């Protein structure tokens, strides 16, 4: 028993159709290995200024006969400062025809995000606090845990196939792995955090030279680009020809010439012999105005986002605390086995 769910390549994010409630209200929501809560845009939400938060489906709790309020406030703040607020509830969630009952979700009534987010990370990373760090609700069973508990999948595990940069769709498989979609062997890597789906990144080879790393990297479907500690990003930037630009007061981004040579590749070395190679076009992000962001940016959190993950097949196993990785093979052939 596995559940395949199509991933829509939206550009900066990958989303899936998820139905919520007794009346199967279709939400198109970001699939996010970097967060752990599922929240939906209330039909009466007050989007942030300038934010079109209702064009990817909305949820009306009152037309779902099964919706229950939990009577606790929900607040989340993501790494880029994006926020959502609402209240916690429970309802039926349906993923490609498979329904789980009584799933805890948040009904969001204010958000700066364009659409809801289905966080599928560790329950230990749930956003159960207010903005001051005071807890408002207990940790709880998020979607992957409930899929296992209700007998829909055997293991809290999922495989991520974002597919190629030009692909319109990819696939996430809950409780299964598609052995047709990678070359070599899947290499199981130990997860290096109990809260974040991070594995040890030994080194990065950029423009032919190795740069020693040795620390954890978050394998985040919900991040567009790649983020490294400032000093390391700066060493890579100097090699790549990227420039840190203060785009507004105390706001910095790496830009790179849009005409930069992208013929090469950037190579990521992980444990146990695993290597993922990324084409260098993934590091020139067109802004659409003749300028380009570099695909690496500085952060106090190390993140390998979509520009990396498109080039790997990943089996995340939250019960075994391993993420198995291999160089992706783009194919519509499938050989899906349960995990």
């Amino acid at each position: 028993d596995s559940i395949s769910l199509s991933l829509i390549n939206e550009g900066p994010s990958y989303a899936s159709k998820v139905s919520v409630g007794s009346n199967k209200q279709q939400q198109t929501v970001i699939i996010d290995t970097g967060s752990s809560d599922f929240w939906v845009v209330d039909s009466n939400a007050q989007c942030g200024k300038g934010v079109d938060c209702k064009s990817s489906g909305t949820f009306t709790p009152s037309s779902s006969s099964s919706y229950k309020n939990l009577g606790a406030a929900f607040t989340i703040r993501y790494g880029d400062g994006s926020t959502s607020q609402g209240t916690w509830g429970k309802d039926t969630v349906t993923i490609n025809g498979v329904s789980i009952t009584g799933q805890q979700i948040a009904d969001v009534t204010q958000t700066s995000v364009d659409q809801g987010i289905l966080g599928i990370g560790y329950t230990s990373n749930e956003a159960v606090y207010d903005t001051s760090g005071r807890q408002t609700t207990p940790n709880y069973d998020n979607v992957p845990v409930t899929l296992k508990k209700q007998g829909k999948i055997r293991t809290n595990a999922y495989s991520l196939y974002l597919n190629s940069p030009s692909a319109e769709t990819g696939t996430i498989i809950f409780g299964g792995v598609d052995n047709a979609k990678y070359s070599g062997k899947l290499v199981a890597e130990q997860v290096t955090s109990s809260q974040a789906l991070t594995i040890s990144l030994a080194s990065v080879n950029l423009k032919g030279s190795s740069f020693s790393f040795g620390d954890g990297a978050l394998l985040d479907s919900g991040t567009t680009l790649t983020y490294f500690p400032s000093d390391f990003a700066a060493q890579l930037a100097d090699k790549a020809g990227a420039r840190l630009v203060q785009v507004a007061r105390d706001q910095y981004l790496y830009f790179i010439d849009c005409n930069t040579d992208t013929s090469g590749t950037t190579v990521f070395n992980f444990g146990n012999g695993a290597k993922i190679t990324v084409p260098n076009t993934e590091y020139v992000y067109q802004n659409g105005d003749g300028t380009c962001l570099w695909g690496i940016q500085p952060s106090d959190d190390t993140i390998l986002g979509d520009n990396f993950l498109r080039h790997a097949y990943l089996l995340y196993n939250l019960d075994a605390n391993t993420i198995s990785i291999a160089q992706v093979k783009y194919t519509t052939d499938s050989s899906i086995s349960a995990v």
């Binding site: 900066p12 994010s13 970001i30 996010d32 290995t33 970097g34 967060s35 752990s36 809560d37 989340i76 703040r77 993501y78 790494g79 880029d80 994006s82 987010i117 966080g119 990370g121 990373n125 956003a127 985040d220 479907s221 919900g222 991040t223 567009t224 983020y227 952060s299 106090d300 959190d301 993140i303 986002g305």
Partner: peptide, 5 residues
Amino acid sequence: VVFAF
């Protein structure tokens, strides 16, 4: 975008 820490 950068989705929770």
